[PDB]
Amino acid sequence: MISYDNYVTILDEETLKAWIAKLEKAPVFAFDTETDSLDNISANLVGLSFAIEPGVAAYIPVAHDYLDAPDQISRERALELLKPLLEDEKALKVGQNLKYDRGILANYGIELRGIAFDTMLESYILNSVAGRHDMDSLAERWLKHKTITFEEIAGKGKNQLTFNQIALEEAGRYAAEDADVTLQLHLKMWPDLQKHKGPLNVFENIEMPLVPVLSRIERNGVKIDPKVLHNHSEELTLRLAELEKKAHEIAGEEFNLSSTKQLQTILFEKQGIKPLKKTPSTSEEVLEELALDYPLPKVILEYRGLAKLKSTYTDKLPLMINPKTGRVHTSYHQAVTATGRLSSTDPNLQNIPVRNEEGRRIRQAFIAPEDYVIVSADYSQIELRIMAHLSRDKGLLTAFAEGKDIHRATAAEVFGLPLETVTSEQRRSAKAINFGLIYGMSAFGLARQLNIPRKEAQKYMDLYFERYPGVLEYMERTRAQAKEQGYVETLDGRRLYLPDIKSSNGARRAAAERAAINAPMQGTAADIIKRAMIAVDAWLQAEQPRVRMIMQVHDELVFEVHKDDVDAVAKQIHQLMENCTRLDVPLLVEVGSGENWDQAH
Ligand SMILES: [Zn+2]
Ligand SMILES: [Zn+2]
């Protein structure tokens, strides 16, 4: 175990002050906030734990209120004594997911500064795909030490105790060990992080500074109109009933909208070709092929889609409105993607259909408060611009340089015809190629997306590579370093480790290769987006203008800008994003505004 002998439980000021004194002279120290909820904005601080060095940690319980809880330093007293240390930018702190702790202290008017090391981000930058980056996994992985699990002290299910109900000493064991272990983890990882300037730069200048900005974005939240969302729900229910009647009307009898069961016995039994359509999917969708002529597969397609959308955003979103703010606070994950892109949950902003009407109606529900407007700043096809840069292709670079539509320019070159005359089919073909390249898509895969025969796709690809040599070179040079060094990195040095690069297995290695070509571009976009956030947030914090960065989805940053400041701010956001980030990639930021996210979008 870990007993009560390990860490002191600070129950008096004198001892707290003694610790604060020791904390002031420690080179770095790890600390944790303990609370009664995961919901940052409404969580209450139950106590704090600090680690001055390995083995020396303490828990200061401030709000444990179970039956007969012993006297504790009051939260306010503890916080006013601790405040100076926490706010001192010179006092360097280490923590596991400091984003969370920074937010909790903010609930008390304390501005956590000195957010120097986050063991979570250390782990993530060391090797994003090494496994899970939570304390329990880290402690075991790096220290062969199994930390006291939260469940161990709190329990499970509905009857799980909140921290304030847990006995002082038990709470002590958990909090102090966590603080202790975080410090040890940092001590093991920090040295490693310096063995390579790449990862080091990323962690230092990209990940770490992003911590307080993510906290700020999450705590600000986004205004969602529940009324609009409910109307949408109602309408969707009517559309589902209607589409369902239309389904039955096209065939005979009633049936679920489930393939490999009901649809095949109808569709192919009424003429068509036997294979169904898996919902794999983004390569062979038999249902939408038939849709250009066959009516039934067309309605089943739209029905399921609307069904998915309704339950996920229409029915859920209103439930996510925080009673304390009356806003939705999405949870961004800084250490989850293999590439380094921020992901999002509750809600997963990225799964809201972009090119679809219903998705648009969802975005319409993301509204600007009175006298404010939504401002969307998007990096126009940044990944394609990155690829142009990475491949040093003058063709692509020039296309972007002279503001031409690369998909049309690509088509103009691949199919050899004037830019003004490239047709939508050709532009769409060049587009399938362009984006196919980012994901390292095989010629056969491109054919499946373009509905053209194999080798016809290959014909297009050979013609591309001939007209755009740099891209092939890039692809080859990337697959090359991938095998030689087992990893690929972004312009900022962010690394993605490809263990199955020499897999000796087929598809597993193939995957590693697609990842090899893709990650540098996707990862670089991530890096850029993160630097834009830091840059923008810095201006926000310094100049204090009437604007809130409320979202980050894909390559766009979304704000709430005061209507009277829109222009000045629009200019400023724009310059910050396409000028105060990397200066090597030809970047373009499309800024838009409107009454809601869909409008600015
Ligand atoms: Zn993008
Ligand atoms: Zn510009």
> Domain holding 278: CATH number?
1.20.1060.10
Q: Do 390 and 467 belong together in one domain?
A: yes
Which ligand has the minimum distance to the alpha carbon of residue 525? 1
Cα angle 508, 510, 512 (rounded to 5 degrees) comes to 75
- What is the token pair recorded at 520? 């540098």
Q: How many whole angstroms from 554 Cα to the centroid of ligand 1?
A: 6
Q: How far apart are CA 117 and CA 92, in angstroms?
A: 8
- Give me the number of domains the chain comprises: 4
Resolution, angstroms, 1 dp: 2.3
φ/ψ (deg, to 5) at 314: -65, -50
CA dist 347 and 312 (Å) reads 9
CATH of the domain at 68: 3.30.420.10
User: Ligand 1 mean position to 489 CA, how many Å?
Assistant: 18
* Cα(129) to centroid(ligand 2), Å: 36
DSSP letters spanning 461-496: HHHHHHH-HHHHHHHHHHHHHHHHHSEEE-TT--EE
The reply to whether 535 and 447 lie within a common domain is no
Q: How many beta carbons lie within 10 A of that of residue 576, not counting itself?
A: 23
Q: How far is the CA of 519 from the centre of ligand 1 (A)?
A: 13
> In this structure, which ligand is nearest to the CA of 522?
1
CA 335, 341, 347, 348 torsion-angle sign: negative
Q: Is there a contact between 180 and 57 (Cβ–Cβ < 8 Å)?
A: yes
| 219, 246, 275 - which closes a domain | 219
Identify the CA nearest to 496 among candidates 474, 471, 517: 517
CA of 355 to the centre of ligand 1 (A): 13
Residue 551 CA to ligand 1 center (angstroms) comes to 15
What 3-state DSSP class applies to 516? helix
Q: Are residues 544 and 396 in the same domain?
A: no
Stated length of the chain: 601
Residue 71, classified by CB atoms within 10 Å of its CB into exposed (0-12), middle (13-18) or buried (19+), is: exposed
How was this structure determined? It was done by X-ray
At 225 the three-state DSSP class reads coil
Amino acid at 154: A
Cβ burial of 481 (10 Å; 0-12, 13-18, 19+) is: middle
Q: Are residues 252 and 193 in the same domain?
A: no
Nearest to 557 by CA among 398, 278, 294, 342: 342
Give the distance (Å) from ligand 2 centre to CA of residue 527: 19
Ligand nearest to the CA of 590: 2
Distance between start and end Cα atoms, the chain: 54
Task: Please state, in angstroms and rounded to a whole number, the distance separating the CA atoms of residues 464 and 433.
Answer: 8
Closest ligand to C-alpha of residue 580 is: 2
- Biggest CA pair distance of the chain: 85
Cα of 577 vs centre of ligand 2, distance in Å, is 9
Residues 6+ positions from 219 with CB-CB distance below 8 Å: 40, 41, 103, 106, 329
Rounded to the nearest whole angstrom, what is the distance from the C-alpha of residue 192 to the centroid of ligand 1?
Answer: 32
| Cβ-based neighbour number of residue 105 at 10 Å | 22
What stretches of 275-393 show up as alpha helix (H) in DSSP?
286-290, 295-309, 357-363, 382-390
**Residue-number span of the structural domain to which 346 is assigned:** 332-381+526-600
- Name the residue type at position 344: S
Q: Give pairs for 533-541: CB < 8 Å, separation 24+.
A: 533/210, 533/213, 533/217, 533/557, 534/206, 534/209, 534/210, 534/213, 535/576, 535/577, 535/580, 535/581, 536/573, 536/576, 536/577, 537/212, 537/213, 537/216, 539/572, 539/576
Distance of CA 401 to the CA centre of its chain: 30
Distance CA 165, CA 473 (A): 62
How far is 523 from 534, CA to CA, in rounded Å? Answer: 17
Distance (Å, whole) CA 282 – CA 134: 32
Does 6 share its domain with 118? yes
Same domain, 211 and 72: yes
Token pair for 7: 């860490």
Rounded to the nearest angstrom, the distance between the alpha carbon of 119 and the centre of ligand 2 is 37
Calculate how far, in angstroms, residue 518's C-alpha sits from the geometric centre of ligand 2: 27
List all residues 6 or more positions away from 327 whose beta carbon is below 8 Å from its beta carbon: 220, 221, 222, 223, 224, 321
Ligand at shortest distance from the CA of 439: 1
Q: Does residue 387 share a domain with residue 260?
A: no
CA of 561 to the centre of ligand 1 (A): 23
DSSP H/E element including 56:
strand 56-61
159 and 185 in a single domain? The answer is yes
Q: Are residues 195 and 125 part of one domain?
A: yes
For the CA atoms of the chain, what is the radius of gyration?
Answer: 27
499: CATH:
1.10.150.20
Q: How is residue 175 written in tokens?
A: 């909090």
CA 383 to ligand 1 centroid distance, Å = 6
Domain boundary among 219, 236, 252: 219
- Of 219, 234, 260, the position where a domain reaches its end is 219
CATH code, 573: 3.30.70.370
Helix spans in 254-325 (H): 264-267, 286-290, 295-309
Residues 388 and 508 both lie in one domain: yes
Shared-domain flag, residues 324 and 398: no
Q: Are residues 77 and 134 in the same domain?
A: yes
Query: How many CB atoms are located within 10 Å of the residue 158 CB?
Result: 5
